[PDB]
Amino acid sequence: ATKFPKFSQALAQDPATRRIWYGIATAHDLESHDGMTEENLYQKIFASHFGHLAIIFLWTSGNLFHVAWQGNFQQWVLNPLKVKPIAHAIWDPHFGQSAIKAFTRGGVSYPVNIATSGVYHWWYTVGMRTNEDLYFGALGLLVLSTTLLFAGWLHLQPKFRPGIAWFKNNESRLNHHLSGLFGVSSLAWSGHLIHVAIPESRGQHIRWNNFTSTLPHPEGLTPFFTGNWGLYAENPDTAQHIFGTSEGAGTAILTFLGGFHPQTQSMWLTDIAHHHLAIAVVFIFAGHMYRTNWGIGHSMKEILDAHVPPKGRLGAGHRGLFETITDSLHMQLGLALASLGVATSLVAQHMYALPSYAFMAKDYVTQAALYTHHQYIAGFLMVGAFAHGAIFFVRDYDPEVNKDNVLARMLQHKEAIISHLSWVSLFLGFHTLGLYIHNDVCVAFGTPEKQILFEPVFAQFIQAASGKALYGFDVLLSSSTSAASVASSKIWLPGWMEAINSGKNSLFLTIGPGDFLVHHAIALGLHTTTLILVKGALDARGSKLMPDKKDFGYSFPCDGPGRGGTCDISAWDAFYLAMFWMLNTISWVTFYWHWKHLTVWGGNAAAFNESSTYIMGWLRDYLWLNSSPLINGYNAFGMNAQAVWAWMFLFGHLIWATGFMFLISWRGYWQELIETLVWAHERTPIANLVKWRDKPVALSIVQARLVGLAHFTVGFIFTFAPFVIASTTGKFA
Amino acid sequence: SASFLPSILTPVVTLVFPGLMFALFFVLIEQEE
């Protein structure tokens, strides 16, 4: 009715404060709202997609506008290695005088924040040189956000709402996505690179007024049409190019030298355009696959129904998977989040391994922040994929449709899967903790020579097979006169070998026993998080303790204290438990990356190689040592520009600590406390005339777990980000 | 002159806008059928 949860009649009649909390918390759960049909659900999701896309482009336009208005892009272009990039200007009426002088840094004269997101290098590579270019990009993205908001409004109109058959058109949507949204966009980016970014790297000034009359190549469409495509690769940029200017430059637009530009320590811009062109052609061909309207093409139902091994090896094969995926939005979303989590972990690895933006791998602060950023986001997406698979099992899985399916057999032998994940996790934890404690006791007792240090020969063999030639394995690419080393010897090999065998890059960092131990720790974390998530997903439909768990839904508090006790029995509680393990393993990964790069950037990799084998070495050489510039941001003798990072460090500590409130103390204590406070307010004079509308009650059990988990996570992020930024900023190496 | 816009917009937005939104949201919460 007129009450706030208009979508839930059950919540609107709640006389307590639980109504507001649950109405806020269940606003986006479009499947369970009152009187919801499938078509209306799909239309609302389409409109929400448009609104979210507009939010993304508004955020990017805001970044562009703030760098254009309050930034030092003009000064940073002229000297990228010595000028600090600027995020935006600071307005604070709470500042003292010394805070105003302390935050006044860079070339500007106002208090200011130094950008650690690397947007300066990215825009500098793609041809931005002035503040007007950034402002025009901000205007374009503002107009795009306006257009997307209008489109979202338009597709909820009665004559423009698409039908349910339009949404479930898998072949047409995948054809158009794979061809257009991937290949045509990659082709357009290759065109932008060749027309603007490559000439800007060579000193030419190409903008909207002269791009249509300036030839990107001296010949121009003659090597392409005649078939002499190798003319575009001749005369590349020499190894004296000096980015942004024209001395030692070339006239090539599509090359595959491989390796790094010698000055910017990033990949060649002509390699990237060639890469994008190849990906464009491949994606257009791949989008030419599924039957839409012209006879040719596949049917996705027939491919899935055909793939049955001959004699019952996988049951009934993939029969019925087409009907389950199309009719369940939770399975599609789970597949999307799993793939996106793999993708953003891949970008996290490859942007430090193979930097593409000019004059990165020398800032080190953007280099740390981007990696930690993308790894934490990867962990979040990975947990969400399994959470939505559990939701799909709870309220979207049809057992009769999936009879003897490849999906039902997963539930058939779920006990074997959970038990073997248990065995792997227990084995890894036992052994890597035993090795770490052994090294701790051996170093503590004055005998570091008694440590168990396993040399990581498999990954070192992989590095040698990629071309690294200090391990002395002499195999494949590391050994000349080999088939792999000869076949590519005149396309991309010399640049790759001169980039992999130098000590200034992050390509295939030299690894020792500490790398072995911490990789085993990472495998432990991955296997245990997978254990919790897979067990929750597979036991979401029921177990021995609760055979009818599907009747109670995905998220419910418990099943009472009977038959032993049923605390944390739902699949939502399995998500809640696996969130801690994801945070733990991402913290392990980021600690390993940050300490290894802190020792490599300072030219002191021996410190990591000697102190990473035992836990006290970590504790006293990474965390205790690198906190000194952070915690000294403000003290009894004054303050500097890292005072905000010290304050945020303590802030994240306090939020992480007050999560333990909701995680350890449970409802009953607080409900009785609330009842005493209710008596207090009702029975005091003057103040009893002020009467509440909603009866105050304690937070519910699932709500309390969510609030404590959100506190734990926010405190986790807000205590790791200031450390990983200020410790790198406080050392410059 | 664009040196006035922080000191104008930041208090207006950050203080005045969410206060009115909190009051409006509370009123919309407590209205009934």
Partner: peptide, 30 residues
């Protein structure tokens, strides 16, 4: 250097985007 007229033009575009955002949010409605 970004002139004041450019900033006010961007503010006008953002205001139009705000009105369309209100329209979309009230088309999904509560």
């Amino acid at each position: 250097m970004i002139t004041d007229s450019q900033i006010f033009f961007a503010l006008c575009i953002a205001l139009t985007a705000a009105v369309l955002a209100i329209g979309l949010g009230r088309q999904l409605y509560v």
